[PDB]
Amino acid sequence: GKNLVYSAPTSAGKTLVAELLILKRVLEMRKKALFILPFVSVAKEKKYYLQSLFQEVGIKVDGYMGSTSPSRHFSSLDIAVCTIERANGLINRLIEENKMDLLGMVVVDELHMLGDSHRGYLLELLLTKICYITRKSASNAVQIVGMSATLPNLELVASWLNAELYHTDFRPVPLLESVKVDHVVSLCYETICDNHSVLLFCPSKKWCEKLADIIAREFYNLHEQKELLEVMDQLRRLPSGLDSVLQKTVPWGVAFHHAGLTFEERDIIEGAFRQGLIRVLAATSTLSSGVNLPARRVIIRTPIFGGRPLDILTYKQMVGRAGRKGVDTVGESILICKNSEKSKGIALLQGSLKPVRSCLVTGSMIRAILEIIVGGVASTSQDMHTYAACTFLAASGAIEACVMWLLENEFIQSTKVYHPTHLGSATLSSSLSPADTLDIFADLQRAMKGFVLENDLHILYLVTPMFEDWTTIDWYRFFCLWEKLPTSMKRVAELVGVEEGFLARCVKGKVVARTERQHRQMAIHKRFFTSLVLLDLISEVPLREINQKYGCNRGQIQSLQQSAAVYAGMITVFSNRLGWHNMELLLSQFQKRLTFGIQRELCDLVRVSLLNAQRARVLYASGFHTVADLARANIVEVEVILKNNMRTIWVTGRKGLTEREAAALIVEEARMIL
Amino acid sequence: GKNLVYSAPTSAGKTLVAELLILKRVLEMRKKALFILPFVSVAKEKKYYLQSLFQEVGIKVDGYMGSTSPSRHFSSLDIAVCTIERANGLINRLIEENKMDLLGMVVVDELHMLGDSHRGYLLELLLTKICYITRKSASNAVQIVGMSATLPNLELVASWLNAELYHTDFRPVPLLESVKVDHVVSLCYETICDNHSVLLFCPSKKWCEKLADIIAREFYNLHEQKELLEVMDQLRRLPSGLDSVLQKTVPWGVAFHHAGLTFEERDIIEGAFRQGLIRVLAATSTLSSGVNLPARRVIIRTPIFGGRPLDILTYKQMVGRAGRKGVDTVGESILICKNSEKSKGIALLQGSLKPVRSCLVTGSMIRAILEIIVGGVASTSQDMHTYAACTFLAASGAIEACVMWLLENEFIQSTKVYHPTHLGSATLSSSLSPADTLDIFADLQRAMKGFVLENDLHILYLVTPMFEDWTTIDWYRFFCLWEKLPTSMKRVAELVGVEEGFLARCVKGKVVARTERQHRQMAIHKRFFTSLVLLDLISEVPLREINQKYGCNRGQIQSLQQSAAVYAGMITVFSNRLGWHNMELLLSQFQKRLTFGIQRELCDLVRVSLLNAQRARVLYASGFHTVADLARANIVEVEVILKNNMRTIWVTGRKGLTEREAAALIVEEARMIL
Ligand SMILES: COc1cnc(C(F)F)cc1-c1cc(C#CC2(O)CCOCC2)ccc1C(=O)Nc1nnc(C#CC2CC2)s1
Ligand SMILES: COc1cnc(C(F)F)cc1-c1cc(C#CC2(O)CCOCC2)ccc1C(=O)Nc1nnc(C#CC2CC2)s1
């Protein structure tokens, strides 16, 4: 229980050590384990893997990722496979409730993210709080396990965490590198003739689509069918339908995988590839940091990705997916270069990843100071410097500046001793960034004076996140929709701040330059467009209909859905902690409605993990209006309802599931819910 | 008519050459002649002097200064004694109306203000426009005469204006500067016994008052009466009454003069000092650049003014007031010093004033570009660079940045010819700075959607200027007034943006730190406090009642009065040019009501220059409700009304006026108006 930080090339079973450590710790100390994964997809994959592995030892495994959360109290859980942001929230809530002693270990995967990143600082703060609380109260308190690629300063991280060090560059499939100067037809032909699949990464999404189409054309012209047809049918029965280009590419074992698709389509392509059924997949940069998806031959189209040299970490994690342990002898990754790109290619071939930074006036420091002060762990400035000493920045004078920033904005109160008033406690328990909480407070307080209850648009405007640019807003379409809007929605539009003059400016004049800080007025109209999209989402309209009506593809629609669900949950917690009972009551339902994009009727019927938003409606239309009603039904009835030995329906973390047994698991899990 | 730029010490008849030049030009060419003065008080004094000097030659003199404007069309005028800002506005209007050829000369006094100052850049833009128009369209077009103290780069100014150069250090009363460091009573006794006046310059208002108090006390302990009693009675019957400290200081030949007093009290004190009735006058830095008030001996309290060494220009214009031409032989300017202040004093005794800068992304450059483009004198970048060359900055590449700034904010439209749209023409005509015109547009547009006509407060909030901090707001009193406000005024308070939360924050907690640009919300509450003060002003409540109710002294109240009058006129012109007829109609009355602080009924009755706000009320309450009704009245009637050979009433630019002939002039001017 002396902590641990180790690194090893992926595909070497590096998570094996972590799984055994979780087993030993949870079985001996009977304490909790937090498994922190960087992204939601890998988080779900790991959650299902842990569930499958450990279901036989009477141990629960349920994770806090995305907009979801375990259906059971955290007390019953034994392993929590959460994400970085939600793991930080978990740590903050545990500190607030004075139950840190319940925690037995915090396993962290992909520790290299702790450096330069928009979410690495959350990991740094989480680990810093663990170290601080462990040092203040005492050698079996809380173990930390870390995983990553070859880190130049891995020993520095181990010293920071007071953990052992273990780094070995061993992989069952050695990776060979000998540059030999598109000329891809013969290469792909000789790769396929060897009975091997191909994974090729492209810089753009349209470029990936086009390359998949071209490769399908090559294979169709020049040169199992049952499983391919099964995958085709699986793709067909989806809310968003089947892509035309995907339609003409899939039958030839060639397809594409980009952020434009929906999560279900991406899952279908990934699962098809893992079986070898897809012989060519044109992916993008996102898949590099996605689920474990090995391929004998990996292809990288160009060192230039998005108008800049491809990152060394991205290249390393792309090449790490070259070779299969147990069936391959040697994998291969090829980076096609050019005369001008030869220098970039040779530069990327050599050199390890850059050193890990700290990313700590800065919003991260204000966040950390708030966390410690309102967590009741660093109240007096005497001990608050020990926390700064515990940070990775120290291990590798802004505290006074940030502390003042919190008192100026009434986040904390001074008495020598600092305390939170109500926005410090509402900000920390809400897991909202203190910088944006001022705007959130101002907007919510304004809404409660003049709220519009005719429709859900005013509630949607308050749970609409604009922390990132999900899509390039089309302003002519937006103006047309504004013209077509009813009066009920226009009332809320005027209330929030949307002006017809600004839309008139944008429809014809170029995007107004937001040079001045006071031009958050641009963010208001983007937020209103997003809120209209969200209203269409929760009105249960098809993804394609929204895509044509607003210009946002289905992938961006789903990403906005997840962001709005998480933001609605966060705002609900904020309002609950601020004592805004009517606001909390209005916002409580919306988290699930955004999560699933369903109407108020289906909220109870989506508590079954096996019931989608489309499957909730067909079961709801048939006459099942509640989980209890589902619990009382024959398998054959739901089977025929769904139909109106070969696998068609798709669900996350699935198995050899067919329509026959799919209905059986709906009632079985419905019974368990009761 | 070859322009001219000359410098000479004040108190040497340095304006005689200028008066001669205006006389000759106006009589020969029969063309107008502006006379730009820096401040409103000196502008009024010069206007009255020119009126007296040229009334016998059929030359009409009436200036555009402060919140006032001539009652007759500019066409009838022969000399316009305007201020820097209003002279710039006059030239802009002349350019807009394509009647620039009416101008025969532009005499500029105190040209040293061209350098470091918040109003010098207006002078630079004015002179640059004169030069550009003269050169683009030609020997005797528009003469420019200049004046200043000893200027290190006077020849540079002459070269910029392409004018002559004359610099002379000659004064009839050669000044004898002498710094020296018990005997104070003896020095005061020997100075006063010489039958000469003394002018002290103290840094603080309170210290000036207290020093005058101690000097009066010492004169009393060590101890014409009729004329001093006349001055005392003149001070007595003023709207602000008589100051107790001034009451006990005046009758000993001692008095004080600061911005705290009212314009009428300052005028009375200055007149009494000029006649010799006041022997000792403790003034402040403001009087240094004010009216021509010579003194035999000037004394400077300490070079430390406002926590910093006294300015060199300020010190020079202080010593310039030492010596009377015609009755005195020599002048003395003593600067008492201490051990620590000896170095600063010695530094101030030696050395001339610093060179004149230009003060030209900068708002001044945006203003200049807007003026030229909207005026139709530089529509293409080819010639606009010529205007840049004409500037004093050139004579001693930001245009592209400024032109984009105007296109970004829709001040001008590109076609490559440039034009104004509506806000470019409305911004130039109103003489509003383009930086603040965006906020003004946003606020006025928002008001027209939800205007409150119950009271005059919502109109006042839109004509309240917050370009400077006229007073330090006492937030406890403001909160008390807030909780005591009616509902009609609270409606407008909530409409504009005033929140009880911010007022509560300020009432107990320290003044909130406005570290962020989004915190113009502090300016809203200061503006509302100022608008309440203005509402009490135009409601015709006494100055003392406002001072007790709000904490702002009478001098600050009058300064805010003038600022609000000018801003109301500017906003009225802005609304007129933008085509806002109802807003212009509502704002049209308020300029005069704010100029005089009267009610709607007295607005017509104050058209007589010889009628204060108090003199309009006593005549109105009697039954004279119109200027025409005044024209039909006997002198004895108005005299008895005023009562209910002694010069007891004060009026600007007065003469041996008592209540007997004061009534006579009221009816005489009433007839002239008709
Ligand atoms: C109150 O906070 C949430 C509420 N609800 C949801 C859910 F509904 F989605 C998610 C959150 C959340 C969102 C982000 C985030 C984020 C972004 O990256 C993306 C969205 O926009 C802002 C930035 C980070 C942390 C949290 C969070 O606190 N998680 C937890 N939940 N239970 C917990 C417990 C417990 C007791 C056992 C001890 S800890
Ligand atoms: C439209 O502008 C005004 C309207 N009305 C008043 C009056 F009612 F007060 C004053 C102004 C004004 C204010 C400032 C100013 C200023 C500050 O320093 C102080 C206040 O806040 C902003 C900064 C500067 C210029 C002007 C102005 O244009 N003057 C003129 N009037 N007729 C003119 C003519 C003509 C035809 C013969 C050719 S030119």
**How many CA atoms lie less than 13 Å away from A539 in the CB half-sphere?**
13
Total residue count of chain B as it appears in this document: 674
> Distance (Å, rounded) from C-alpha B401 to C-alpha B421?
19
Q: Count the helices and strands in chain B (H runs, E runs).
A: 32, 13
CB–CB contact A518 B520 (8 Å): yes
Contact of B247 with B213, CB cutoff 8 Å: no
Protein residue with least CA distance to atom 39, ligand 1: A90
> Distance (Å, rounded) from C-alpha A534 to C-alpha A463?
10
> Distance (Å, rounded) from C-alpha B266 to C-alpha B270?
6
> Distance (Å, rounded) from C-alpha B432 to C-alpha B568?
11
User: How far off is chain B from A421, nearest CA to CA, in Å?
Assistant: 14
Number of the ligand closest to the Cα of A85: 1
Contact of A443 with A436, CB cutoff 8 Å: no
User: Which DSSP string corresponds to A56-115?
Assistant: GGT--B----TT---SS-TTT-SEEEEEHHHHHHHHHHHHHTT-GGGEEEEEES-GGGGS
The beta-carbon contacts of A236-240 under 8 Å, at least 24 apart in sequence, are: A237/A648, A237/A649, A238/A262, A238/A264, A238/A265, A238/A650, A239/A264, A239/A542, A239/A543, A239/A612, A239/A613, A239/A614, A240/A264, A240/A265, A240/A542, A240/A543, A240/A544, A240/A554
B410: left (phi over 0), alpha (psi -120 to 50) or beta: left
CA distances (Å), origin A408, targets A82, A229, A433, A639, B513: 34, 64, 16, 62, 7
Contact of B253 with B189, CB cutoff 8 Å: no
Through-space distance between the first and last CA atoms of chain B, rounded to whole angstroms: 39
CA distances (Å), origin B442, targets A499, A509, B438, B572: 11, 19, 6, 15
Contact of B155 with B174, CB cutoff 8 Å: no
B332: left (phi over 0), alpha (psi -120 to 50) or beta: beta
**Amino acid letter, residue B128:** T
Residue B518 touches chain A, beta carbons under 8 Å: yes
CB–CB contact B518 A518 (8 Å): yes
> Distance (Å, rounded) from C-alpha A374 to C-alpha A421?
9
A85 CB under 6 A from ligand 1? yes
Number of the ligand closest to the Cα of A575: 1
Discontinuities in chain A (C→N > 2.5 Å), after residue: 138, 181, 223, 360, 396, 415, 644
Cross-strand partners of B103: B32
Nearest CA in chain A to B520: A518
Contact of B391 with B128, CB cutoff 8 Å: yes
A602: Cβ contacts below 8 Å, ≥ 6 apart: A596, A613, A616, A617, A620
User: Which DSSP string corresponds to B122-139?
Assistant: HHHHHHHHHHHHHHH---
Contact of A597 with A540, CB cutoff 8 Å: yes
Protein residue with least CA distance to atom 5, ligand 2: B569
Nearest CA in chain A to B513: A408
> Distance (Å, rounded) from C-alpha A315 to C-alpha B503?
57
**Amino acid letter, residue A372:** I
> Distance (Å, rounded) from C-alpha B660 to C-alpha B637?
11
CA distances (Å), origin B74, targets A312, B94, B104, B106, B425: 75, 10, 14, 15, 21
At A132, is the secondary structure helix, strand, or coil?
helix
Residue A520 touches chain B, beta carbons under 8 Å: yes
Please give the structure tokens belonging to residue B564: 């609000």
> Distance (Å, rounded) from C-alpha A175 to C-alpha A296?
10
Q: What are phi and psi of A112, to 5 degrees?
A: -60, -25
> Which single residue is written with the structure tokens 């061209």?
B114
The DSSP call for residue A420 is: E
Exposed (0-12), middle (13-18) or buried (19+): which is B172, by Cβ within 10 Å? middle
> Distance (Å, rounded) from C-alpha A235 to C-alpha A256?
13
A11 CB under 6 A from ligand 1? no
A65 CB under 6 A from ligand 1? no
CA B89 to ligand 2 centroid distance, Å:
6
A436: enclosing H helix or E strand? helix A434-450
Q: What are phi and psi of A82, to 5 degrees?
A: -110, 170
Please give the structure tokens belonging to residue B439: 């906020």
B38 CB under 6 A from ligand 2? no
Protein residue with least CA distance to atom 8, ligand 1: A569
CA B432 to ligand 2 centroid distance, Å:
9
**Partner residue opposite B517 with nearest CB, options A410, A505, A517:** A517
B200: enclosing H helix or E strand? strand B198-201
| Nearest partner of B84 among B38, B34, B118, judged by Cα | B38
A377: Cβ contacts below 8 Å, ≥ 6 apart: A95, A129, A132, A133, A136, A387
A195: Cβ contacts below 8 Å, ≥ 6 apart: none
Mutate which of A79, A86, A594 to test ligand 1's pocket (most atoms within 8 Å of Cβ)? A86
Number of the ligand closest to the Cα of B82: 2
Residue B361 touches chain A, beta carbons under 8 Å: no
Please give the structure tokens belonging to residue B486: 């009616």
B431 CB under 6 A from ligand 2? yes
Would you tell me how many other CB atoms lie within 10 Å of the CB of residue B474?
14
Cross-strand partners of B331: B175
B578: Cβ contacts below 8 Å, ≥ 6 apart: B422, B423, B426, B441
User: Which DSSP string corresponds to B425-465?
Assistant: HHHHHTT--HHHHHHHHHHHHHHHHH---SSSHHHHHHT--
Radius of gyration of chain A from its Cα atoms, rounded to whole angstroms: 26
> Distance (Å, rounded) from C-alpha B148 to C-alpha B110?
5
Instruction: For A255-305, give the secondary structure using H, E and C.
Output: EECCCCCCHHHHHHHHHHHHCCCCCEEEECHHHHCCCCCCECEEEECCCEC
| Nearest partner of A173 among A327, A64, A354, A278, judged by Cα | A327
| Nearest partner of B497 among B455, B456, B443, judged by Cα | B443
At B569, is the secondary structure helix, strand, or coil?
helix
Contact of B175 with B15, CB cutoff 8 Å: no
CA B584 to ligand 1 centroid distance, Å:
53
> Distance (Å, rounded) from C-alpha A55 to C-alpha A36?
20
> Distance (Å, rounded) from C-alpha A231 to C-alpha B424?
64
A673: Cβ contacts below 8 Å, ≥ 6 apart: A71, A607, A608, A627, A631
**Partner residue opposite B518 with nearest CB, options A410, A512, A517:** A517
Residue B515 touches chain A, beta carbons under 8 Å: yes
Q: Check the CA dihedral B459-B461-B462-B465 and report its sign.
A: positive
Protein residue with least CA distance to atom 15, ligand 2: B85
**How many CA atoms lie less than 13 Å away from A241 in the CB half-sphere?**
10
A25: Cβ contacts below 8 Å, ≥ 6 apart: A1, A31, A33, A104, A105, A143
> Distance (Å, rounded) from C-alpha A428 to C-alpha A573?
10
CA distances (Å), origin A535, targets A90, A556, A564, B643: 30, 15, 11, 76
> Distance (Å, rounded) from C-alpha B314 to C-alpha B288?
7
Q: Check the CA dihedral A36-A42-A45-A49 and report its sign.
A: negative
> Distance (Å, rounded) from C-alpha A616 to C-alpha A330?
47
Q: Count the helices and strands in chain A (H runs, E runs).
A: 32, 13
B207 CB under 6 A from ligand 2? no
CA B324 to ligand 1 centroid distance, Å:
81
User: Which DSSP string corresponds to B269-311?
Assistant: HHHHHHHTS-SEEEE-HHHHTSS---BSEEEES-SB-SSSBPP
| Nearest partner of B298 among B263, B333, B323, judged by Cα | B333
Strand pairing class (B418-420; B412-414): antiparallel
> Distance (Å, rounded) from C-alpha A606 to C-alpha B230?
94
Please give the structure tokens belonging to residue A604: 């109870």
Would you tell me how many other CB atoms lie within 10 Å of the CB of residue B274?
15
CB–CB contact B518 A513 (8 Å): no
Please give the structure tokens belonging to residue B600: 């709607």
Contact of B361 with B369, CB cutoff 8 Å: no
At A419, is the secondary structure helix, strand, or coil?
strand
CA angle A207, A211, A214 (to 5 degrees): 140
- Biggest alpha carbon–alpha carbon distance for chain A: 80
Task: State yes or no: B11 annotated in a binding site.
Answer: yes
> Distance (Å, rounded) from C-alpha A584 to C-alpha A587?
5
B367 CB under 6 A from ligand 2? no
User: How far off is chain B from A370, nearest CA to CA, in Å?
Assistant: 20
User: How far off is chain A from B551, nearest CA to CA, in Å?
Assistant: 27
> Distance (Å, rounded) from C-alpha A332 to C-alpha A279?
15
Contact of B157 with B165, CB cutoff 8 Å: no
Q: What are phi and psi of A15, to 5 degrees?
A: -75, -10
Contact of B200 with B299, CB cutoff 8 Å: yes
Contact of B319 with B179, CB cutoff 8 Å: no
User: How far off is chain A from B411, nearest CA to CA, in Å?
Assistant: 14
> Which single residue is written with the structure tokens 């009880």?
B500
| Nearest partner of A249 among A297, A282, A206, judged by Cα | A282
Contact of A201 with A168, CB cutoff 8 Å: no
Q: Check the CA dihedral A90-A96-A99-A100 and report its sign.
A: positive
Through-space distance between the first and last CA atoms of chain A, rounded to whole angstroms: 39
Would you tell me how many other CB atoms lie within 10 Å of the CB of residue A672?
9
B466 CB under 6 A from ligand 2? no
Instruction: For A512-529, give the secondary structure using H, E and C.
Output: CCCCCHHHHHHHHHHHHH
Number of the ligand closest to the Cα of A574: 1
Residue B508 touches chain A, beta carbons under 8 Å: no
Contact of B422 with B394, CB cutoff 8 Å: no
Contact of B282 with B257, CB cutoff 8 Å: yes
Total residue count of chain A as it appears in this document: 674
> Distance (Å, rounded) from C-alpha B153 to C-alpha B167?
11
At B145, is the secondary structure helix, strand, or coil?
strand
Residue A469 touches chain B, beta carbons under 8 Å: no
User: How far, rounded to the nearest angstrom, does the alpha carbon of residue A550 sit from its chain's CA centroid?
Assistant: 24
Task: State yes or no: B18 annotated in a binding site.
Answer: no
Radius of gyration of chain B from its Cα atoms, rounded to whole angstroms: 26
CA B122 to ligand 2 centroid distance, Å:
12
Would you tell me how many other CB atoms lie within 10 Å of the CB of residue A266?
22
Residues of chain B positioned with their CB less than 8 A from the CB of A521: none
Contact of B586 with B606, CB cutoff 8 Å: no
Instruction: Say what the resolution is, in angstroms.
Output: 2.9
> Distance (Å, rounded) from C-alpha A377 to C-alpha A393?
19
> Distance (Å, rounded) from C-alpha A371 to C-alpha A133?
13
A566 CB under 6 A from ligand 1? yes
CB–CB contact B408 A520 (8 Å): no
CA distances (Å), origin B21, targets B4, B148, B391: 10, 17, 25
> Which single residue is written with the structure tokens 């400024």?
B402
> Distance (Å, rounded) from C-alpha A482 to C-alpha A476?
10
Contact of A623 with A571, CB cutoff 8 Å: no
Please give the structure tokens belonging to residue B41: 């008080």
> Distance (Å, rounded) from C-alpha A163 to C-alpha A400?
30
Contact of B530 with B466, CB cutoff 8 Å: yes
Discontinuities in chain B (C→N > 2.5 Å), after residue: 138, 181, 223, 360, 396, 415, 644
**Amino acid letter, residue B230:** E
Residues of chain A positioned with their CB less than 8 A from the CB of B517: 516-518
Residue A508 touches chain B, beta carbons under 8 Å: no
Protein residue with least CA distance to atom 12, ligand 2: B86
A291: left (phi over 0), alpha (psi -120 to 50) or beta: beta
B591 CB under 6 A from ligand 2? yes
Please give the structure tokens belonging to residue A578: 């601020």
> Distance (Å, rounded) from C-alpha B70 to C-alpha B59?
14
**E strands along B360-449, which residues?**
412-414, 418-420
> Distance (Å, rounded) from C-alpha B481 to C-alpha B485?
6
Cross-strand partners of A200: A282, A299
